[PDB]
Each structure stands twice: as structure tokens, then as C-alpha cells.
Amino acid sequence: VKAAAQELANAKEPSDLIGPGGRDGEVPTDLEQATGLERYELLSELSGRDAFDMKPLDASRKGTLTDPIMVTSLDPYRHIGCTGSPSGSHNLIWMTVYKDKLRRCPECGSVYKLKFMGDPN
Amino acid sequence: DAPSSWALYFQDGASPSYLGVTHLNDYLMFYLTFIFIGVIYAICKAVIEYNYNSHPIAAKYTTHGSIVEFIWTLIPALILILVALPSFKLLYLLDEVQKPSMTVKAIGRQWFWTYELNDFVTNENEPVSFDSYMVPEEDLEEGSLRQLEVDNRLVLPIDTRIRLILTSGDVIHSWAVPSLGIKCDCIPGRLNQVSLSIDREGLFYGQCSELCGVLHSSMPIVVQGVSLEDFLAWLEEN
Amino acid sequence: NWLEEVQAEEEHAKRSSEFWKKVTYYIGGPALILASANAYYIYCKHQEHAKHVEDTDPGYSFENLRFKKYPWGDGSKTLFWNDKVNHL
Amino acid sequence: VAGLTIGVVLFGLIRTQAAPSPRTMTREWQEKSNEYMKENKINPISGEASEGFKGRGQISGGIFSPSEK
Amino acid sequence: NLSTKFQGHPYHIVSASPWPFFLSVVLFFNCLAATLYLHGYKHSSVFFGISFLGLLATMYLWFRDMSTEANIHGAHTKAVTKGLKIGFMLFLISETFLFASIFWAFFHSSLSPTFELGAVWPPVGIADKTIDPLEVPLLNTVILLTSGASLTYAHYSLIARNRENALKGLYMTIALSFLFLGGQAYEYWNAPFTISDSVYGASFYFATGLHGIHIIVGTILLLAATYNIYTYHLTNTHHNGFECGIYYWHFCDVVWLFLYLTIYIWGS
Amino acid sequence: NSWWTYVNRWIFSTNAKDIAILYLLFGLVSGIIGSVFSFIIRMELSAPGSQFLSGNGQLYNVAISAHGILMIFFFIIPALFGAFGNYLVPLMIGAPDVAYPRVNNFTFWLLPPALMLLLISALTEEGPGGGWTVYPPLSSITSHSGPAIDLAILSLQLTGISSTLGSVNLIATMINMRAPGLSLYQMPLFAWAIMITSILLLLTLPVLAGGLFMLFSDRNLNTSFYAPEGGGDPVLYQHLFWFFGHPEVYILIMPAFGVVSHIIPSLAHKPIFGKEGMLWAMLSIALLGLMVWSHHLFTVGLDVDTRAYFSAATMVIAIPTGIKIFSWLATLTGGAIQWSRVPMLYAIGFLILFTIGGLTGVILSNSVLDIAFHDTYFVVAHFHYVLSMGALFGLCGAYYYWSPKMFGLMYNETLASIQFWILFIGVNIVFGPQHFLGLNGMPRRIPDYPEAFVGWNFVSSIGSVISILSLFLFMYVMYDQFTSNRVVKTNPYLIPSYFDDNVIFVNEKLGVAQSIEWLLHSPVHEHAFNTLPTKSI
Amino acid sequence: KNTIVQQQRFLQSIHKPTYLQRPGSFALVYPYYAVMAGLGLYSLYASGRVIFGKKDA
Amino acid sequence: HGVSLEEINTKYNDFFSNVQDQFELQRGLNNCFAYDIVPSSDVIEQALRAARRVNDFPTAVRIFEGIKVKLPTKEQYQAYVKELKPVCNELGIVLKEDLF
Amino acid sequence: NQRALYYFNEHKWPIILGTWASTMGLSLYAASRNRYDTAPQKLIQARMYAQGVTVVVLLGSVYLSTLAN
Amino acid sequence: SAPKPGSTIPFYINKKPLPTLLYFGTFGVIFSIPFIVVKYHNRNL
């Protein structure tokens, strides 16, 4: 776990993600005989974080200009959807949020500010 | 009895089941014309007046059915029961069997129809049988009807009820006559039992419906009623 | 953490594997050998052959239908044709 | 309107290249059959043997039943 | 930033793959060859063989490439393998509903026999030539039941991280399946009636053929799986094929027990 | 060298976008051949007697059978069921690609050899003669001698197994690749419908596979499966065939239901009335459309109790469909309507034709009533006025509604509207007189007819001619749209509300749509949905 | 003996498509493609003979 | 169900009592004109005051245009304009029919 | 009882279907109560129990079927 | 690779003067196939 977390932190290129390999005469285990994106997924899930973002947003904290609801965005365009007040407030409409601009809800008035956890290029 | 030109109704016929079928059809048409014209008018009026140039504001905030969906469930279902019941008692009247009198056989192999009346087997030992054939176009009698005549025409007496036997020994055929409203499938191997009753004394027309190869359209069926003395003379003639 | 759960799962799997080995080498074998012995008895009882019967209502009018020639050989032979159990 | 008239005209133009019609499509035979099935009470209720019967019955009329050439 | 070099979705990306188009082409070849051989046209022997070898080559290469991609690139994420399992389950449900057709065919042909059959579903004169309930097929059924028990034992031992026990169980299962196939061939040779003999023989033969081909598919799956196990390409959690084969074999055994209940008890 | 790139982008490509276009093109090239076949068969029956032919009845049987089979299995199913689903379902579910790309690529290419072999079979000395529903004794080696109908059987088999293989990946894709926060209940109606059709088709078609194979084996292995002397009962064949045929038309028409329920709101700017009730009624229809199959065997001669059981339940199908039509009628009123839009025109014209066709279908669902119309032109009128008015209209509306998303071009509104009007008038005057022709008591599938029927056939022929001009205009408009370089914005069907400023709307309102597909650029990217869209949980 | 890691690292270094990543795969497809082309050429004549009623003798 | 007829009237008057953003004003004004509820005198007057506050002219004339469109007959519109004329003359509002 | 056995062996199919359903239900109820036992594994164990019971009742029925006096 | 589609997926290049004849000829032959089909069945007659 902690050693695996250190291994995850210590990496340079995707070519370096490898498995040590099992021992002949016995069935190996995924902790030593994994390769490719499956290895990345398992290390990410054991490290405690998420490989990709799969967190559905919350309908509370109605949007305000000073404090907009934050949305994880690996991309400058991060399409989302708004229900507004806690589930059942209004129909679900889709929105797109550009780079660091605010998208306000046309029924509730909720702004979703955007960030970017990655270099643009 | 026979097709006309530019026809709109079905035809004028004579059969106890045919009148009931026409009555049921009239009631069912009376039922459906209502709904058809209603839906047509609703579709026309909900659009002809609510175009964008006249209704720029849309009441987008009504998407709940309080008491309307229930009536949608009930009223057409009420109409469904109202139409189902008469058809049900008509069918439960038709499924019974009256007192048998005599039978005919309608075996037909391919592009011709054979009829048998073997009820009257007696010391003469001469059962009556023949084959009805498509009359050629050239040899049609002056004033005849093309595609609807046969040479050896079938003969059944009037006001006498016959428990017709339907059978085939080849690809499946059908035995249809719109005036009498009686039909069944000439399914090989198995015999189909159907009844019949003619009220008038007239020539009736019909043909098969289920395709049986290249000449599926070359076996017309003609059955005409006869009086008792004419029937007896016809029977003693052969 | 992972050690306790993996040990428990492996222990349960090993116990089930031992139980299933006992199942496959305790009851399945006797049933198989008993069935084999009974099958051999039935097979050896009826070694009288006499599988050539004719003239006792032959054919029955729905045997060996020939509407399209059989592809194998001349056209009157089947893939599993036998000279003792298949006749005409 | 133009599409409808083009379709009608084209169908009419490609119509004449068909096989000759059966010999029974003549006014004479149509009227002979009309007077024929009346005798055998074929549909006398409100059809081919009605009491008055000003209507046609078994005549299509128009081009379908032309005069004998 | 390691995630920057990576994508944002755990689903695999494939390209090229000329296998589907040429597989369609070779299937068309096989269909044309079979249609020609049905009517006994000349030069119809080598055509069918060549088409079948082409089909064998194409789907064998497809399977090899798919297994390779599932091995090196490691696209066998949890969602992907879950979806694969649901797809396999959907396929076996489709197989059940396919077999239901022949089941209803036998039921209709049996419950209401024609009037030339002597008012009995067992044909007159052939009824005494039917298959007795207690003979070699019963031995084959008990062999299949013991084979399933041994396969379950091997699977549980493999769960217990055991090579020898699971491998021996798989070897016993393969040998038992091979002897079952030999016994089925022997029963086929000693068939009292041909498929063309009445509807009883036709329905029996149609019912047995589908089970035979499904069991052949199971045997090829088992030998392939033991090939991967020997090649050292299977791990504890990278074992979707093992569970798929186990579920399929239990499904086919249930279908076989239903067939044994109906055809060899009700019809005899 | 772009040739390698050409064939890798088209043949050795497994992207969903690059395949649905080929689905549409294959559907089009099948539909043209089918329409010409229909035109020739309708021109044959313009007047009584042999006409343009030497009385060749077998040729007419080949023509009708080919038209039916190719237009029911090569025009509508492959170009509607999976053509607009594989392209669009990943967009609405929140996934970048289908579950199994390789099977998606494989399913498409099983169809071209099917078309070639079907054409070869029809080009034999005799050709198929059993019609769309071929029957064993007629198909028996006694009637046909040659490789004519065996290839048709094989084509049906392989097309069915391909369609089943083309529907296994879709269900997994829309059951496991759902967006984070997208409950299955909250799924859009179109994908709901398409999943229902997928499950119904996969559940039913195997039965056809087995039955068709066992029936075909009669010609080669001389099996007694259906021989009258061999103990076989053809009523079993009819039951097997109509356990499939009855739900096939529903699974073909449900995509039309979904596309209409999608076209109405966006061009009406009003949410769909009663989504949950509509989808639950459609689920009731889907479950209901299986236990009723013997309405096609009303005059065969089955027992009274079975006839009553399977005729009473025929009526209950109407209630959910009437509820759906009433819901759409309620949705239309109140909200704004842009009646001049071509998709709106097709959606509006769909409803009246579908409801009159449904009334005709409920006419002949009684054993007491079917005896006067079984295997006559009335059933032809019913099933044609339902099929070509619902499925064809839905396909045309879907094309005219999602074409910018497929390619990124604009069509000509004037020519499209003219084509719609011409086609509507032609198809209304084509199947109109056939109602009277079947009401008189005259059967179907007859190249010759008694003389007292000429007028209605003459009235039908002109409309049949008109439909060909409609097809020509559609071809011209498709070509013009393809080579007009008319640009299209991100969401062409989004307009400012009654209180949106011309400067506020342009800068603080763009990029909003009722569905996901309108959020992306009209020519969609190869790799969309890099991150999963997350809604309110 | 467990060479799967070594061969994995050896084969991940190439950018070829997965159906040509393993060396020696190309030699099993080119004659395969030639045989498929020959099969198509023969089947063309076979179908042409089938449609045109005749048999060689 | 949810809000009744008059409750939404009072709620929207309270909301329009304090609006400082053009976008929010337009949003609430759109959402008000969908309940078949013609605004009362206080509601329209407060909407006009809000439009004056957020410094947007065309919204004011759009109010009267939309009210004229929504109202069923000419008599109700004439009564509304008669009872609201002073306001429009106080805030310098020019009607559409007199604008051009 | 000399009469209960007659009905017990008269209708083998209905009673065998009933006992199969009883075994299926009982095995599902008993097996689906543990932690280290997924649903497919418990279903497989239940089906194995059903197969064994079916085999033993088949042998018993074919043994008792000889009493056809 | 991050290319931007030019909103052109026609499966084959299209332009005014030359390709029109090819498109129309393909349409005509695929329209007129049924003709040769109906002629084939009445060749030896």
C-alpha cells in the first residue's frame, strides 16, 4: 500500500509501469503479474485516489456568484447537467463550461466555476 | 353476390351468418368513425391556431396528469368492452352445430376443384363426382363474366343446411365465398368441417385466397341454389 | 488489512477444495463403477443379434424418404451407414 | 402541383405501350352481361337487378369500356 | 503528471482488424459451398474444405489477437470484464431461447400425433425399437454429472491458489468429456432409426446435434483454457474465461438433464 | 499515399460514426431496388389481363416475394433499428464508444453478401415463389427444382443471426456504460425504446433460426418435419413463424415511436407530457406483444376456446397506443409549434396515418370479422398503411432531423417540403382505393382479377407513379445537401426565449441543449467524452 | 522460465497494430490473402455456372 | 403538485423586489410568464422598477409587448395601460405602437 | 396403504415437478445466507443438489415402475 | 493526433461538373437493375 503508493509517485513515463512477475510452478497474483492500463487502474484504486473522475455532483448549495460549485474538469470543456434544488426541482438540462468562465442555471441560477488539473499543452 | 364497378359497400348477399357479420361491421364502423374524425380534428386544430407567429409564449410548465390519464385508461377501454361483447355473443352463437342433414366434399389438387356428394350411396352404387374447371376466355358465352365462371358448376339446394367437408391433397388451398361469409383452409391431411345455409335461389361466386403456385388465380368457385324438384332432377340426371 | 481477508478467503477455498476432493474420490467413483458394471451387463445380455427382419409388414410407408439424392456416395448411403443395424 | 401533373402526364404517356386489352372490355359485352345476370337474380336487392336501377352496375364507363373498333 | 499522458476513460481502443470483413467473406464462401453441395454439384468437395480451413484460420487469428490485446495492453478493467460477463450471460439466455424452439417442436409433434400414427406417439412397430431408459446413455449422464463435480472441485482448488489439484481435475474432466463423445458416437452408430424415419427420429437427431456441437465448443474452450494455464498467462483475478466456461458448462449440463428427462423417459 | 488511410478510415475502422453512414447508404441502395420492384408490380395490375408480360405468374410471384423480403429485411430494419442507434445511443448514454467495437464492425458486413446471394437466387430459372411467408409444401422439391429458394432461406438465416449479433453489444453498452448519475429510470425515451426492441429481437429471432433451419432441411435430408404423409403438421410451421412475425413489426416501429417522441419536444419547445406513464405503457406494450400470435391463423380452423383466448387479447394492445397518441396530442397543444419545419411536418403527418392504420388493424382482430377479410386486399391496406406510414415516415424524419450531426450540412427546405407533400399525397392515394378493393371481397396476390375492379387499380397506378418522382426529388435533395457546403452551428435547433437579449443570449446562453448530441460540434470528434459528464446524484 | 514479463517489455516497444505486433505474423496473412483472392476468383465462375443452367462435361 | 395561483404571484413580486443582475431579472421574468398568470399591478410596477434599477431600457417595452401578447382581449390591455400610464410617463416609457 | 402408492406412481411428472420446485426453493433459501458465497456459486450448488436428487428419484421411480400387476 | 473535421464525410469526393454524371449513372443503373432482372426470366420465351 504505502510502498505501492511510493511506486506510483515514482514514475517517469508510461513505459515504466510493469509487474515484477510470478514464480514458476505456482499460480501468480495480479499484484506481480499485471501489465497495461489494468495495472494503472489497480494502483490508482489501492492508492486511495481515483484513476478518472466519476463523482456525480451534488444538488445542494444553490449557486452564488461569490461561491460557485466546483466541477472536476480534465478538459477545458466539461459537459454537465443541472437539476437545481435537491432532486425533483426541475427537468435535467445539459450545460457546457468553458475555461474559467461561469455557467448560470436558466431556472435556478447556479454558477459552476471550472478549474483544470493539468497543463493545457 | 357479384362485384360491381366503383363499389363502396361489400355486396348484396344471402346467408344467416353474412347478415350478422354485416350488422357487426356496421356497429364497429359506427364506433371507429367517431374516434377517427375526433383525432383528425384535434390534430388539425391544435396546430392550425397554435403556430409560432400567433403563440410566441409556450406554457412549458404543465407536464403532470392529475385526472386525465385515468379517463384515458377508462373511456377507450369502455369502448373496447362495448365492441367486444357483441362479437363474443356472435361467435358463441356460431360455434354451435345445428341438426346435420347432408355433406359435400371439396377436395382440390391444383388449378381445379373436385366436388363429391357421397351421402346418397344406395343400390345404384354410382356416387356423384365431377371437376369444376376454369372456362377459357375464347370459349366464354356471349355476355359471360371473365375469370368468374366454371364449366361443371356446383349445385346445392336452397333452405337445406349442409355440413361441408373441406379437404386437400396438395399444397394448401382456401375455400372462400364472400356472399355466404364462410371460409376455411384446404389444409392437406386434415379435414375442415364447415356449415352452410342458402336463403335465396341464386348464383353465388367466390374463389381461393391462399397462394398455391403460379396459377393460384385460376380456380373460381360457383355455387348456385336450386329448388327441391330441380335438385332431385339434377341428382337423377347423373 | 489485505492479509487477514486473503488468508480467510484462501482458507475457505482450501477447505471447500478438500471437501470437493473427498466428494469426487468418495461417492462419484463408486457410482461410476456401478453404472459401468450395470451397462456392461446390459450390453452382454443382448449379444444375440438377429437384426435382419423383413416381410412382417415391411416399410410402413414412411421409412427412408428419398426426395433429394443424398450427397455422400451414390445417393443411397448415409454418413453413419451400417451393414448390420441399417437395412432396407 | 407541377409534380402531380408531371406524374399524371408520364403515366399517361407510358400507359399506351401496354398489351391489348381483353375482348370483353367493349360496351356491347358489358351491356350484354348487365342484361344477363339480371335474369338469374344475381344481386337483385340493391344491385344488378334492382326495381328501378338507373345506375350502371357492371359498367366501368369512360375509357375502360370503349365502343367496338 | 502521470494522468496527463493517459486518457480519461477505461474503455479499450481498437483499430485495423481486417478479421470481421474477411470473416464475412469466408462465411459467404461457406454458405455458397454448402448450398452447392446440397444439390450434389460437381467439384463441391475441395471447395467446402478450403472454405472451412479459411474460416478456421480467420477466427483462430481473431481469438489470438483478442487474447493478446487482453494480455499485453491490459484493457481488462473491472467495467469491461463485468460487461463481458453480462454479454456472455445474455448469449446463453439467447441459446436457451433457441433451444426452446426445438423443445416446442418436439412437444407439438408428440402431444397431438397425426391419425396415421396409430393414435400413439411411439410409432407402431418402432415403439419396441425405442431406447430403454436403463442403458449406456444413463452411464453417460452419470459420467457427465461426475465430470461437473470434478470441474467444480478443480475450480474451487484453483480459487485456493492450487495448480496441481485444479490441473488434475481439468484433466479428468477432459478425459471424461472425450469418453462421453466416444460413447455418443457409438450410440449414433447404433441408432435404431434414421432421421428421415418418422418425426420421432428427426426430432431426436435434431435435439442431439445441438447438444453435441455445444459440448464440442465446451471441449475446445477447456483445451484452450488449459493451454493458457500451461503457458502461464492466467492469474487470480485475470480469470474471466474460467468463470465463463464454468457457467456455460453448468448451463449445458442443466439443458442435458432436461433432455434426458424428456426424450428418454416420456418417449419410451 | 492516402489509399491506405482511405481503407483504414472506412474498411479497417471500427468507430461507430464511420459505420452508421454505411448503414444508411446500404439501406438506400436496397430501398431503391425495392421501390422499382414495387413500381413494376403495381404497373402490372393497372388493367385486367396479362400486361407488359406473357402472363408469367411465376415471374409475378418472384417479383412480389423479392419486393417484400428485401424491403422488410434490407430497407427498414438495418437502416433504422441499428443505424440511428449505434451512432446516437453512446451520445445519450455518456460513453465514448460501444462495448464491443469488433462485433459492431462485423455485423455490418454480413449484409452485402446476403444481398448478392439473394439477387443470385432471384436470378435462377424459377426463383422464390412462396412469397414473404414461404410455406413448406410449396417450397417442397416437388414445386421448385433448383437452388432458388434455398439461398433465400440462407439469406434470411444469416441476416437474422447478424441482427441478433448486432444487438448484443448495444444492450451491454446501454446497461453498463451509463453516465455517472444517470439512473436507468432517467434514461431518454429513444434509448428506452431501442433497448426494448433489442431485447425483443434477441429473445424472439433464435426461434426463427431453428424453425427455418429445420424447415429447410426437408428439401435436402428428406425429413418428415412438415410432410402431410410424414406426420408433420404445417400449422406448427405457421405457429412458429407467427410467434416471430407478430412482434417483428412492433420492434420495427418502436424506433419510430422514439424518434417522434424526440422530434416533438425540441421543435415544440415544450417537455414531453407524462414521460413515466408513456414509458411504462410502452413497456406494457412490449411485454404484451408476445402472448398474442394466432391472429394470423384465424381461418385455419383452430378450436373455439383458443380462438376466443387469442382474439380477446388482440384488442388490449390498442389502449396503451391510444394513451401514447393522446399524450402526444396534449404535448402538441399549448406549447409553441413551428409547423414549417420538415421534421415537424413528418412528425405531424405520422400521427394521423398511424392512428387510421391502427383503426384498420383493430377492424380485423376478430375471428367473426377476419373471415370476411382474411388474405384479401384489406389486410394489405392495413399493414401497408401502418408500415410505410410509420416506419418510413420515422426514418425520413430522423434523417432530416439528425443529418447535420451525421455530416454537417444543410439541405434545401423548399425542395424537402415539396418532396414531403408529394410523397404524402402519393402514398395517401395509393393505399386508399385498396381499402375499397378489399372491402368488395377480392383476394390479394393475384396478377389477374375479375373485370369489375379496374377503376380503383387505375386510381392506384397514378399514385404509384407519383411516388417515383418523390424518390427522384429525395435523391436530388440528398445530392444537393451533400455538395452545398452549407455550414451548421453547434445546436441549430436552439432559439432565444421571449425575454433573451440579443447580446446576453449570444454570449451567456450558448452551449445549452435538451440532449447531449447538440452540445458537441455537428461533425463529432473521433474521441468524444474524454471525461464522463456528471449530473446531480 | 516466466518469460512473459521479458517478452511483454520486448513487444511493447513497437508501434505496430496489435494484429502485426508479434513478429512473423505478416508471413501467415499475405499467402492467406492470396488464397482468399483465388477463392473469390473461383467462386465468381462457380456462381456464374450456377445461375446459367448448364454443367461441364 | 406544488405552488398555487396567488402564491407564485406573491413569491415573484418578492423576488423582483430585489434583483441586481440583468440575467436573473430576465430569468425570473421568463419563468413568471408561463403559469397563465397575468401579473398584477404591483408585480408589473415592481418589475418596471427593477428594470430601471438594473439599467436596461428595452426590457421595459418588452414587458408591455409581452403583456399585450398574453392578454386575451383588447379591453383588459386598455384597462392595464390606462391604470399604468402615469408610471410609463414618469419613467419615460414609449409604447411599441407609438415608437414606430 | 395399497392405494397411496398407486397415485404416487400414477402421476410421476406432476409430483416430480413439484419436488424439483421444492428442492430448488429450499436450496436457494439455505445457500443464500453466507458471505463467502456469491450468487452464481450458490445457484450452481443448488442446481447440483437438484441434479443429485433428480438422479436418485429417477432410479427410485424406475425401480418401483416394475410393479405393474 | 487532434484533427478538426471539416464537416465533410461523403465517402467520395463531390463537385459540380464531372462527378454529377457518375452519380446519376450509378443511380440509373441501380434503378434499372430490376429491368434486366425481369428480362432474364423471359429470355428464351
Ligand code: HEA
Ligand atoms: C407495422 C406495424 C404494425 C402495427 C403497429 C400493427 C398493429 C396492429 N395489427 Fe397488424 N399487421 C402488420 C403490422 C402491424 N400491425 C403486418 C405486416 C401484418 C400482416 C402480416 C403478414 O401477413 O405478413 C398485420 C396483420 C394483422 C392481422 C392479420 C389479419 C389477416 O391477415 O387475417 C391482424 C389481426 O388481428 C392484425 C392486428 C393488429 C392490431 C390489433 C394492431 C394494434 O397494434 C393497433 C392498435 C392501434 C390503434 C387501434 C389506434 C390507436 C388507439 C386508440 C385511438 C385508442 C382508441 C381506439 C378504439 C377504442 C377504437 N394485424
Ligand code: HEA
Ligand atoms: C417494409 C415494409 C413495406 C414497405 C415500405 C412497402 C412498400 C410498398 N409496398 Fe409492399 N409489401 C410488404 C411490405 C412493404 N411494402 C409486404 C410484407 C408485402 C407482402 C409480400 C408477400 O405477399 O409475399 C408487400 C406486398 C405488396 C403488394 C402485393 C401484391 C399483390 O398482392 O397484388 C403490393 C402491391 O400493391 C405492395 C405495394 C407497395 C407499395 C406501393 C409500396 C411503397 O411504394 C409505398 C410508398 C413508399 C415509397 C415509394 C418508398 C419511399 C422511400 C424513400 C423516400 C427513400 C428513403 C431512403 C432513406 C433515406 C434510407 N406491397
Ligand SMILES: CCCCCCCCCCCCCCCC(=O)OC[C@H](COP(=O)(O)OCCN)OC(=O)CCCCCCCCCCCCCCC
Ligand atoms: C455449418 C453448420 C452445419 C451444422 C449445423 C448443426 C446444427 C445442429 C442442429 C441441426 C441438426 C444436424 C443433424 C445432422 C447431423 C448428421 O450427421 O445427419 C445424419 C446424416 C447421416 O446420419 P445417419 O442416417 O447415418 O444416422 C443413422 C445411423 N445409423 O449425416 C448427414 O446428413 C451429413 C450432413 C449433416 C449436416 C452436418 C454437417 C454440415 C455440413 C454442411 C453444412 C450445411 C450448412 C447449411 C447452411 C448454413
Ligand SMILES: CCCCCCCCCCCCCCCC(=O)OC[C@H](COP(=O)(O)OCCN)OC(=O)CCCCCCCCCCCCCCC
Ligand atoms: C453452430 C453454432 C456455433 C455457436 C458458437 C458460439 C460461440 C460463442 C461462445 C461465446 C464464448 C466466448 C468466450 C467467453 C467470452 C469472454 O469472456 O471473453 C473475454 C475473455 C477474457 O477473459 P480473461 O481476461 O480472464 O483472459 C484474457 C486472455 N487473454 O476472453 C477469454 O480469455 C476467453 C477464454 C477462453 C477462450 C480461449 C479460446 C476458446 C475458443 C472457443 C471457441 C473455438 C471455436 C469454436 C467454433 C467457432
Ligand SMILES: CCCCCCCCCCCCCCCC(=O)OC[C@H](COP(=O)(O)OCCN)OC(=O)CCCCCCCCCCCCCCC
Ligand atoms: C443467432 C444464433 C447463433 C448462435 C449465436 C452465436 C453466433 C456466432 C458467435 C458470435 C459470438 C457471440 C458473442 C460471444 C460473446 C462476445 O462478445 O465475444 C467477444 C467478441 C466481440 O466482443 P469484444 O472482443 O469486442 O469484447 C471486448 C473484450 N474486452 O466476439 C467475437 O469476436 C465473435 C468472433 C467472430 C465470430 C463471428 C462469426 C460468426 C459465425 C456464425 C456462423 C457459426 C454459427 C452458425 C449457426 C448455424
Ligand SMILES: CCCCCCCCCCCCCCCC(=O)OC[C@H](COP(=O)(O)OCCN)OC(=O)CCCCCCCCCCCCCCC
Ligand atoms: C374517445 C374520446 C373520449 C374522450 C373522453 C375524455 C373526456 C375527459 C378528457 C378531458 C380531460 C382533460 C381536460 C383538462 C381538464 C383540466 O382542467 O385539467 C387541469 C389542467 C390545468 O392545468 P394545471 O394542471 O397546470 O392546473 C394546475 C392546478 N393548480 O389541464 C391541463 O393541464 C391540460 C393539459 C393536457 C390536456 C390536453 C388535452 C389534449 C387532448 C386530450 C384528449 C382529446 C380527446 C380527442 C377525442 C375526443
Ligand code: CUA
Ligand atoms: Cu388455390 Cu391458392
Ligand SMILES: [Ca+2]
Ligand atoms: Ca395485369
Ligand SMILES: [Mg+2]
Ligand atoms: Mg390465410
Ligand SMILES: [Zn+2]
Ligand atoms: Zn437548475
